[PDB]
Amino acid sequence: LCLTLKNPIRRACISIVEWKPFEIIILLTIFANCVALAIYIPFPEDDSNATNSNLERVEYLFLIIFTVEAFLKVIAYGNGWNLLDFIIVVVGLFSAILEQATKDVKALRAFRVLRPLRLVSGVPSLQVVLNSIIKAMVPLLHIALLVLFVIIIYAIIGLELFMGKMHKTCYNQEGIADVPAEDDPSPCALETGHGRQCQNGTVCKPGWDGPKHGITNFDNFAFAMLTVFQCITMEGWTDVLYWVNDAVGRDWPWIYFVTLIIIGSFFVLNLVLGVLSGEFSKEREKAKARGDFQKLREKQQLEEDLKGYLDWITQAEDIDPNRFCRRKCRAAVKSNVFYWLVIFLVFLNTLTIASEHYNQPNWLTEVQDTANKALLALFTAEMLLKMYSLGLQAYFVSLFNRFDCFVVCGGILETILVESPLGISVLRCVRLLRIFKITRYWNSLSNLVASLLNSVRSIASLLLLLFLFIIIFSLLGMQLFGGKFNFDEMQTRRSTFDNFPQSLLTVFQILTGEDWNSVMYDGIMAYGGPSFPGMLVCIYFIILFICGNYILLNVFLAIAVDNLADAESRFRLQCHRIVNDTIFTNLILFFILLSSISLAAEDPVQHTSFRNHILGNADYVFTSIFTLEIILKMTAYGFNILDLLVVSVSLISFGIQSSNVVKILRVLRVLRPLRAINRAKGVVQCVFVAIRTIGNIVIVTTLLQFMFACIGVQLFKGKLYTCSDSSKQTEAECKGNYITYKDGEVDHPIIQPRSWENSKFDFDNVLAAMMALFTVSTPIYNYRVEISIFFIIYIIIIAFFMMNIFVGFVIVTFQEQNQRQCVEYALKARPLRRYIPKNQHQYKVWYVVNSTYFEYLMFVLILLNTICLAMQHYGQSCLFKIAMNILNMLFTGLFTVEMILKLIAFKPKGYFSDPWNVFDFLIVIGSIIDVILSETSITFFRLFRVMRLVKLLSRGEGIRTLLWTFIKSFQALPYVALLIVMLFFIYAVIGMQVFGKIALNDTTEINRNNNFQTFPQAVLLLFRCATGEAWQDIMLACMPGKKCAPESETPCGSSFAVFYFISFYMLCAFLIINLFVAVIMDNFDYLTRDWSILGPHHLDEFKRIWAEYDPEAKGRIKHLDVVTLLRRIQPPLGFGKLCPHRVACKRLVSMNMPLNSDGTVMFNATLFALVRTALRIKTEGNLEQANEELRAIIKKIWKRTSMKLL
Ligand SMILES: COCC(CCO[C@H]1CC[C@@]2(C)C(=CC[C@H]3[C@@H]4C[C@@H]5O[C@]6(CC[C@@H](C)CO6)[C@@H](C)[C@@H]5[C@@]4(C)CC[C@@H]32)C1)COC
Ligand SMILES: COc1cc(Br)c(C[N+]2(CCOCC[C@@H]3CC[C@@H]4C[C@H]3C4(C)C)CCOCC2)cc1OC
Ligand SMILES: [Ca+2]
Structure with a gap:
């Protein structure tokens, strides 16, 4: 609200003078402070270097410039973004001057990290990106109102069952001390609770603050909500589960987590993608509206024009003939002789480069040098000759040719240099150009590289915003937690806000979630213990994992949806009788249905306890059953390739007579x-096509990992070798023994032996680098920091194109996959009634129960009950528990009132005729039974209460619709769901049969809580791997050499492991992307709709208004509709304030009406007429055009007695 106090002059006319010069210096000051907050090293205690104090000095210049600017601009006016300036200044000068005499800013001076927001504010280049980002999150607020609901429901359910049970721990050795359990202490359970039982001479006893310093316990509510949250982010969900499993037994803890994950992450994860993608498409559409794609095609046609007449200007000297040389080189470039030859020289040169390996003899070193020397001369002559034939200009024009020239110059440079080793290696890394000069598989290679340039170019500004965000957070990190990470442990923390470099690293790890929850603890245990004010440090490590990841996802998607596409665009008779009748069909479906259970249910540990034992006979019998499947065999043999798999399984089943591997090779039955x-019905080729596409994509990544690492060899060879004794720095020096003090105990000398060892990820040869590159997918700073960044790029690049080729590949799936629908909701639609009270008493209650207020009150009471079950700590004064129980009684009683009232405002059937009403009924009865039991399992009848909260979701249209829609599509995902369960099942039986008897050792990963001995536990282990939870280690635990279990009676753990788990991970990921894509695509109408124009949801309102003015199940409205016709019409549909008594009536009578009586016209007439006015318009004569159009097209000519219009 501009004051417009235009007091002559000297108000403004100061910053008005030299706008651009004065604006810039402020921006330069902002950039100087963004580089001033990144020096001050934050320190232990109060020590300071000269610079720090000297930067506090220049903060007294940045706090005289920002104040004169502020006041001079205030004089002008005295809005939004400028509020950031004002608050930053206020807090600023303040803080300082306050502290001016004080000589604990921290917080008070942890605000200046908000100054880099003025970098966004001033520069308008990414300010538009920030509005796009903000304006894209507006739809997905219903999803932020639901992630929250799931978390709350889960936290509440959780504190109720598992709170306070995690406090024991094997606490001794029948002597006197502390948790002995190695280190890892894990809730233990007394000799009566079926939890872990403690062994040896250990004893369980109360104490142990917690599972993990007390921050991973459902004790108390806040710890509970937070635990659930850390838990849904799929960052150690298995661990919380195991601690809980240890404490309360293993039978029911798991259901609660599997759900949390499936309903919390997979389901919730899809919505964000669906909401985000729909938004991108809207933007993509606006972009198409621009006509840019057509313009880009015209630019490429221009490019081929300059080439196609570049050959013409080349020929221009044919009539001007020196000339001979030109003609020769022209033929050459065209002559394949040059092409194939040069391609060959590439690979061979490529070879040379890869040849390099540590400890290389001259046999190799000599050869490499000799080759390069000549190979380099080769490329030169060729490029040089290609210069003349081609048009110098157009030759430099083609990006690839230009890069070629650049890198040949690199060779010249390196040669004249030889006339540091690192620099030479770098230049040779540059020479990997030719490596890809051949453009192998350009079909993709070219597109990917071209796209890559286009893609990277496209998201420049978004990447800028991401970087700004990261820098801001890192500065806050160093200010907030910097210096507070001295926990007095020689333990080396990779994540520490000691300095900005590390600060950035910590932030990235949190963003990547590598150990982000762990980093939380550092702060939440730094500033203070796991107490009250010591947790307001966590409110930070989240704001980074949601916001950062949000921006990150926004930036990715763009790559995809917004580029890839733009870029990519007698006896036999009787036999048939029986074998066609249900019996020999639906019945057989059963004979295998439960037969399949045979392999599913079996004892794969103990030898032949009846259990396992007898199960052989059933196999035998199902197999005689398959012989019977021979009576059906020649019935009509030579859809039967399935029948050959029946033949094979049937034969191997009879082959079970004396055989093992074949036995375990029987899971094919499930696929029947x-x-x-x-x-x-409803393709096999499509599947095959998808598989081919997937394989192809594997190869791209494979070759990349090759070239990227051939870079590593040249750069890191021989820089990881080291000795155990840090003091020694030469292989020769490292010979003998040294002393190590356990945990830095001066009084704990340990005579270890010195050894010269190469570190992990040994780039000693292309090969090891190769596998390490797989290892990242599957010292500290000596030279590590550098390697670190190398181990971040393979990623970027990998994804960058693994996605590119694939998601863009998919869309064809979409190719395969409003006015009409609105017509069909106007036609083929019937009006509805509403229960009216037939009795006076039945009525008063009705008015009330339906009185809006009553609903208002119900919701208030619901909030209260949950705010009464939330407060349940670990140690609550008994008075308090009594209070809580009495309160629950009051609440249950109040709900009884409503049930009974409603049943007296709506007849029994009416109340019960509504799903929500029946839900309420059930909650109530169960809650009352709980009350009874208490005044006197029980727990189950208690959780109930909490559920009610859900009914608060059956409210806002925005949330109601989204869920309903996706739920209304979680059935059209069958083929991508049966497929997934099939996978789990098969892999599980297979697994339980090979990696089964591996003995269980709590110290390893095949512990009693993640074994492979009962179908259920194996499916849980497979779900862990799928959920991407350290699947790796489980895999290592399944390699040969593990001892066979005692009941099994190291011949165990077949090597197949790698194939299994890796194959599993891969297949799972695919099937799952297929699931998500399927769902969203299928529901891609809601996910993108111009709510402005008319849809169905904008149309149902008419029924609820019409029935409101309509007694029974009726139609045939009275003429007194003259009021309601526009009484309450959504302005998108009709008018909103315009005089109702307008032509509105004259036009509604203007079109002909159906030849009915005075009051025998259906609601369909008014509805469809309003829709028509709301949609495409037509004139007279077109009356019949419209008529025939309706009864020829919309659901074809669905016969309708639509006499006259509508
Ligand atoms: C009705 O049909 C209309 C249809 C509309 C076109 O749909 C586009 C919308 C984006 C959509 C659905 C498309 C392809 C792959 C989809 C992606 C797979 C990726 O999977 C994820 C999962 C999570 C990430 C870790 C990896 O990538 C998502 C980010 C990514 C994804 C789900 C984002 C959405 C993408 C194309 C056109 O019809 C011809
Ligand atoms: C109703 O008819 C149907 C229509 C469609 Br579309 C589908 C879905 N399908 C299956 C989707 O995935 C099939 C491709 C493969 C199935 C196995 C995994 C992941 C991928 C496969 C590559 C490894 C049918 C096959 O081609 C199109 C997609 C199933 C139907 O049921 C037969
Ligand atoms: Ca993880």
């Missing part, structure tokens, strides 16, 4: 039902 579902 999968065919039946695709047989629900």
Whole structure:
């Protein structure tokens, strides 16, 4: 609200003078402070260098410039973004002057990290990106109102069952001390609770603050909400589960987590993608509206024009003939002789480069040098000759040719240099150009590189914003937690806000979630213990994992949806009788249905306890059953390739007579039902096509990992070798023994032996680098920091194109996959009634129960109950528990009132005729039974209460619709769901049979809580791997050499492991992306709709208004509609304030009405007429055009007695 106090002059006319010069110096000051907050090293205690104090000095210049600017601009006016300036200044000068005499800014001076926001504010280049980002999150606020609901429901349920049970721990050795359990202490359970039982001479006893310093316990509510949150982010969900499993037994803890994950992450994860993608498409559409794609095609056609007449200017000297040389080189460049030859020289040169390996003899070193020397001469002559034939200009024009020239110059440079080793290696890394000069598989290579340039160029500004955000947080990190990480442990923390470099690293790790929850603890245990004010440090490590990851996802998607696409665009008779009748069909479906359970249910540990034992006979019998499947065999043999798999499984089943591997090779039975579902008809080739696409994509990554690492060899060879004794720095020096003090105990000398060892990720040869590169997918700073960044790029590049080729590849799936729908909701739609009270008493209550207020009150009471179950700590004064129980009684009683009232405002059937009403009924009865039991399992009848909260979700249209929609599409994902369960099942039986008897050792990863001995536990282990939870280690635990279990009676743990787990991870990821894509695509109408124009949801309102003015199940409205016709019409539909008594009536009578009586016209007439006015318009004569159009097209000519219009 501009004051417009235009007091003549000298108000403004100061910053008005030299706008651009004065604006810039402020921006330069901002950039100087962004580089001033990144020096001050934050320190232990109060020590300071000269610079720090000297930067506090220049903060007294940045706090005289920002104040004169502020006041001079105030004089002008005295809005939004400028508020940031004002608050930063206020807090600033303040803080200082306050502290001026004080000589604990921290917080008070941890605000200046908000100054780099003025970098966004001033520069308008990314300010638009910030509005786009902000304006894209507006739709997905319903999803932020639901992630919160799931968390709350889960936290509440959780504190109720598992709170306070995690406090024991094997606490001794029948002597006197502390948790002995190695280190890892894990809730233990007394000899009566079926939890872990403690062994040896250990004893369980109360104490142990917690599972993990007390911050991973459902004790108390806040710890509970936070635990659930850390838990849904799939960052150690298995661990919380194991601690809980240890404390309360293993039977029911798991259901609660599997759900939390499936309903919390997979389901919730999809919505954000669906909401975000729909938004991108809207933007993509606006962009298409621009016509840019067509313009880009015209630019490429211009490019081929300059080439196609570049050959013409080349020929221009043919009539001007020196000339001979020109003609020769022209033929050459065209002559394949040059092409194939040069391609060959590439690979061979490529070879030379890879040849380099540590400890290389001259046999190699000599050869490499000799080759390069000549190979380099080769490329030169060729490029040089290609210069003349081609048009110098156009030759330099083609990006690739230009890069070629650049790198040949690199060779010249390195040669004249030889006339540091690192620099030479770098130049040779540059020479990997030719390596890809051949443009192998350019079909993709070219597109990916071209796209890569386009893609990277496209998201420049978004990347800028990401970087600004990261820098801001890192500065806050060093200010907030910097210096507070001295926990007095020689333990080396990779994550520490000691300095900005590390600060950035910590932030990135948190963003990547490598150990982000762990980093939380550092701060939340730094500033203070796991107490009250010591947790307001966590409110930070989240704001970074949601916001950062949000921006990160926004930036990615863009790559995809917004580029890839733009870029990519007698006896036999009777036999049939029986074998066609249900019996020899739906019945057989059963004979395998439960037969499949045979492999699913088996004892794969103990030898032949009846259990395992007898199960052989059933196999035998199902197999005689498959012989019977021979009576059906020649019935009509030579959809039967399925029948050959029946033949094979049947034969190996009879082959079970005396055989092992074959036995375990019987899981094909499960797949005998999968065919039946695709047989629900509705492609095999498409599947094959998808598989081919996937394989192809594997190869791109593979070759990249090759070239990237051939870079590593040249750069890191021989710089990881080291000795155990840090003092020694030469292989020769490292010979003998040294002394190590356990945990830095001066009184704990340990005579270890010195050894010269190469570190992990040994780039000693292309090969090891190769596998390490896989290892990242599957010292501290000696030279590590550098390697670090190398181990971040393979990533970027990898994803960058693994996605590019794939998601863009997919869309064809979408190719395969409003006015009409609105017509069909106007036609083929019937009006509804509403229960009216037939009795006076039945009525008063009705008015009330339906009185809006009553609903208002109900919700208030609901909030209160949950605010009464939330407060349940670990140690609550008994008075308090009594209070809580009495309160629950009051609440249950109040809900009884409503149930009974409603049943007296709506007849029994009416109340019960509504799902929500029945839900309420159930909650109430169960809650009352709980009350009874208490006044007197029990716990189950208690959780109930909490659930009610859900009914608060059956409210806002925004949230109601989204869920309903996706739920209304979580059935059209069958084929990508049966497929997934099939996977789990098969892999599990297989697994339980090979990696099964591996003995269980709590110290390893095949512990009693993640074993492979009962179908259920194996499916849980596979779900962990799928959820990407350290699947790796489980895998290592399944390699040969593990001892066989005692009941099994080291011949165990077959090597197949790698194939299994890796194959599993891969297949799972795919099937899952297929799931998400399937869902969203199928529901891609809601995910993108111009709510402005008319849709169905904008149309149902008419029924709820019409029935409001309509007694029974009726139609045939009275003429007194003259009021309601526009009484309450959504302005998108009709008018909103315009005089109702306008032509509105004359026009509604203007079109002909159906030849009915005075009051025998349906609601369909008014509805469809309003829709028509709301949609495409037509004139007279077109009356019949419209009529025939309706009864020829919209659901074809669905016969309708639509007499006259509408
Ligand atoms: C009705 O049909 C309309 C259809 C609309 C076109 O749909 C586009 C919308 C984006 C969409 C659905 C498309 C392709 C792959 C989809 C992606 C797979 C990736 O998977 C993820 C999962 C999570 C990430 C870790 C990796 O990538 C998502 C980010 C990514 C994803 C789900 C984002 C959405 C993408 C194309 C056109 O029809 C011809
Ligand atoms: C109703 O008819 C149907 C229509 C469609 Br579309 C589908 C879905 N399908 C299956 C989706 O994935 C099939 C491709 C493969 C299935 C196995 C995994 C992941 C991927 C496969 C590559 C490894 C049918 C096959 O091609 C199109 C996609 C199933 C139907 O049921 C037969
Ligand atoms: Ca992880």
